[PDB]
Design a protein around this nucleic acid. Structure first.
Length: 37
DNA sequence: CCGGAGCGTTCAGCGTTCGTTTATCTCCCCCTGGCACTGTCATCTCCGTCAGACCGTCGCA
């Protein structure tokens, strides 16, 4: 919680794992499965 | 010596024309939705106030 909240938001994004092709299509399949459920 | 004709004014028959509306047809404005090689972290601030106080804050003692 500091000034210039855009920097705090960018740090809040943090080190999230980027998605390659296989992880992205697996997540899309899980998206469709959860939607169907 | 009234009588008639001509003239002034004032109204009832139907006959046309207005005053104000209505739905349909072009032209335009305005808002929500589509785009499928990939493309995954910016941005320059801020200095030669200034003058000292008021105040909380904070690590050292």
């Amino acid at each position: 919680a500091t000034a210039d909240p855009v920097k705090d938001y960018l740090k809040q994004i943090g080190k999230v794992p980027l998605l390659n092709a296989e992880q992205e299509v697996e997540l899309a399949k899980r998206i469709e499965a959860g939607l169907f459920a």
